[PDB]
Nucleic acid binder design. Structure first.
Ligand SMILES: [Ca+2]
Ligand SMILES: [Ca+2]
Ligand SMILES: [Ca+2]
Ligand SMILES: [Ca+2]
Ligand SMILES: [Zn+2]
Ligand SMILES: [Zn+2]
Ligand SMILES: [Zn+2]
Ligand SMILES: [Zn+2]
Lengths: 63, 47, 244, 231, 244, 47, 63, 231
DNA sequence: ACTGCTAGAGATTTTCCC
DNA sequence: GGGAAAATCTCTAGCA
DNA sequence: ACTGCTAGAGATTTTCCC
DNA sequence: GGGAAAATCTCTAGCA
């Protein structure tokens, strides 16, 4: 009843950025979403992005 | 303790030095002769 | 080599030579010549070669007035999606700006607006409208238009689309709304291969769904890891640190 | 991979769930689940808006209601003119995915200017929205003393209706309902584009449902098979 | 899918959608939608995202007039070294430009000058001076100031150095020549760690020495490789190809 | 045979199409209605 | 009497550029100098640069 | 590496060639060859310009001659004023590496403005250049009919003298001679900077001549050694 | 205490198709 | 494992 | 048939020093 | 083989 919701929140993609790199890093895996930070998993690397530096979408090319 | 030499509102001249109060990601808050100013980091040099 | 320091300062007071010239002419290490040129107030004339990054939260918008054919176009962008709202206003006044902003906040979930320091946006009228609608007002650094770079890029793109379909409309109002239609729904590409209209509903529906999903997750996982945010098999995220 | 397919086929013929439930429950691609729900015989509107004109204080307020969600857009217009109606309609079509508008056959709704605007934006015209009009008029009466003009009171009422009046089943506002409805319609359109892209392929003679990185899902004579393609 | 081509052209004639929108909406491959958007005259509004490269031969200079404190400064740069010649001229006329150019050609081996299309440089007076001195005149593309990017960068740097030492001089002529001194001899860094004054004599002495050395080499090696330019142990350069 | 859509002397509008006569490293020489023009390659698109 | 001159012309350094890369590639070895082209050896790679794309210096930090 | 060192030491004590010949002939670094020529006892000006004023047609032409090369710079000045002389001198010091100027002690050369300009530019003042003045005046007479003004004839004469009048030993013009002389002076200054940078190091007590990537060249008691360092 | 970006054109690299 | 197509990278104007 | 560049500031990578 | 210094890379304003 809980792992279904955890995999559902992991089905969301995050496009994030770093502090001085102006390019948009690719679609990561959303692990956790907070009010000020967003914990992602990009390239088997768990990062904590600020919320103001992330665009989270469920890509509707999931079909 | 830092010195900040900054560029200001539509002025080509560079003012300073000023006390650095806060350094952010893309802007700094400084104090040049009892004037709290917010300058971008492209228009400021911190020593 | 303090004789080199004395002659290098005495020469830099005249010629304002850089650190390479003083390090080559007076046998100085680069640290000392860099200190000599850094202690001069007249030689600090260049800033950091970087750029900041705008706030791309799902609730922040960016507003700006542009001018086309002698008329004023008030444009707002959703900076997380590129969704464009635009109107032709009869005057660049805080009354029309507050009307546009109240109408936009009634249309979409506007949490924050990021404008420049134009009188339109700095007025008391736009300040009562954002207080009533619950919008936070962020103002950029004055005469730094790059702090609102999303809305200026969208002003450029909107003027380009207006110029493409200007001969299909008899007034500029029709051409502005036709360009808003074309940008929001007839041009794709970006972070999902979407148009801006698909991308804003993806951003907002994702915000709602992830908020409700994390609210249902958080009320179940109540572990204290030596507060658990996310447990995996290789790492564990707590609060926010990633413990191995 | 075939295990989830047979579980979904049995679960659909015993329960008749749609393709979204079979794609969430059994980890299938949505083309496979839609072909499962389309193989059955028992199981054989987000773009429709409705426009009306409401008269308050002598002024005229044009009101468009999303009939699937109840989301509303209102504008105090200077006159009941086809120019103002076509301007409102081009604005609304630029803001939201408007496919059909339902009007009340007035002199301004059947104008040539509104017909030209619906031709340009691609809108089809058809000739309980009064409940939405009554709730908007009572919210305007609740909020009229907070505005100086009527044009800045109908926008306050549209804000209160779309984001501050929650109800229905899940207690969502009209804005959350319209973004969920439009997101569902975008998922439907993307699934239809995915089906139309592979509806001309034939696999050796069988259909092509899903071409994975290691597997190819075909349908030979109402039998979904997984085998590891001509157009 | 020619029905998709017909409806995509009929929709692009209204909305001017890009190739991604027509490829997503009408089931088109990217080549066909790119052909539809490339056959439209109204959609060609962007050029190549590149830059050219100026001619950095050892004999070509770049001239430009700038304005400072209401006075006209005629500046020339050696674009292979950054060596700056500059004068304050009483008027932006072809007579003063021809005098400056004849004086510069008498001072340094000027083979080519690359100016814009300013009337000063486009005149018949500067055209007789370059004919007498043997200078070739290259003119840039009009209203493309990047084609003379070396001299505009040196105008920026020269104005910065003038602003640094403006309070040491009572007239602008003295400040311009002081800045020319500081740029040519008191600021180092570049392709050799040189100043511009060291770099121009390195460029020109290298040109003379390599010309004489290749003239003495060429009159000895007279082999025909199936004309020998340079024989090595791994390759052989002929004329100009590098045969293994 | 190429089409060239170019940008001209201080004009924001884009003209064309024109015959491409010569393509260089950073500029093109084209012919738009019996007018030989030299445009930079940043201000021109060749199809 | 000739290889001395060949090594002398190989003691010169060339700073060259390519057609679309705006960065200045580092000090190569001057093999041959002509009126329109310059044959260099950069990173054991023999290139033919145009003369208008090369700055040839004898670096006087040869001491 | 020591082989070229002993060949250069024997060749210097039999022939007395300078450090440039010993650095070109035996592939030594120039610090080693200069220490070889400095160890001997038998073998124990590019910045000097000279300024004069020449009167033609009533106008005054200030003429600076590089006394090592014969390269010339002339300007028709409006008056024999210390302002005009200091302006010419600051121009000339900005164009070329001017270290010393030799004048003819006139009222304009001993002015306070020229003294301030020589103090700022770093020039020292000292109080067959008439051969250069005569050749310039005869080239002006050869070229006066090709110009309208005298100011644009002295620049034509400076062009003809500096780049179109070849002579001397190798048949070089004055421009090639001054760029070879200034390049030789820059090589001399870079060698002096390289010597001064390592003149404080001592290697264990011996000098440090050249610190290679695999070898260290020292001098212990007039004996250049190669061994594979404190300041 | 706040902050360049966006869309298109062409080149380069990666992935798919037998 | 080549060729073609798609995805990604690089870079620029123009909006202030 | 012609063409962005230059110098400085800070980050990152490579080389030297025992 | 770490630490420090030097060399190299990245990026920006401002000149048109
Ligand atoms: Ca503004
Ligand atoms: Ca100019
Ligand atoms: Ca603006
Ligand atoms: Ca200019
Ligand atoms: Zn200084
Ligand atoms: Zn069924
Ligand atoms: Zn088009
Ligand atoms: Zn001797």
């Amino acid at each position: 009843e809980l792992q279904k919701q955890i995999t559902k929140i992991q089905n969301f993609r995050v496009y994030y950025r770093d502090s001085r790199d102006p390019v948009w890093k690719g679609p990561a895996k959303l692990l956790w979403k907070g009010e000020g930070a967003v914990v992602i998993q990009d390239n088997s690397d768990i990062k904590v992005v600020p919320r103001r530096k992330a665009k989270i979408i469920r890509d509707y090319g999931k079909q | 303790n830092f010195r900040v030499y900054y560029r200001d509102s539509r002025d080509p001249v560079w003012k300073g030095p000023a006390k650095l109060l806060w350094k952010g990601e893309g802007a700094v808050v400084i104090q040049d002769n009892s004037d709290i100013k917010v300058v971008p980091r492209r228009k400021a040099k911190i020593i | 080599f303090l004789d080199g320091i004395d002659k290098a300062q005495e020469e830099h007071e005249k010629y304002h030579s850089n650190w390479r010239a003083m390090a080559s002419d007076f046998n100085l290490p680069p640290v000392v010549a860099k200190e000599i040129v850094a202690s001069c107030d007249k030689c600090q004339l260049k800033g950091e070669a970087m750029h900041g990054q705008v706030d791309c939260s799902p609730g922040i918008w960016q507003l700006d007035c542009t001018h086309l054919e002698g008329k004023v176009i008030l444009v707002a962008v959703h900076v997380a999606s590129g969704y464009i709202e635009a109107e032709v206003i009869p005057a660049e006044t805080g009354q029309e700006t507050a009307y546009f902003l109240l109408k936009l906040a009634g249309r979409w979930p506007v949490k924050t607006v990021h404008t420049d320091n134009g009188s339109n946006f700095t007025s008391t009228t736009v300040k009562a409208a954002c207080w009533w609608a619950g919008i936070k007002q962020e103002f950029g650094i004055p005469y730094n238009p790059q702090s609102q770079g999303v809305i200026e890029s969208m002003n450029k793109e909107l003027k380009k689309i207006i110029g493409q379909v200007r001969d299909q409309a008899e007034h500029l109002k029709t051409a502005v709304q036709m360009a808003v239609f074309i940008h929001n729904f007839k041009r794709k590409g970006g972070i999902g291969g979407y148009s801006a209209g698909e991308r804003i509903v993806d951003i907002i529906a994702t915000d709602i769904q992830t908020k409700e999903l994390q609210k249902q997750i958080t009320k179940i996982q109540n572990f204290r890891v030596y507060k658990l945010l996310w447990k995996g098999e290789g790492a564990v995220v707590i609060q926010i640190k990633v413990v191995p």
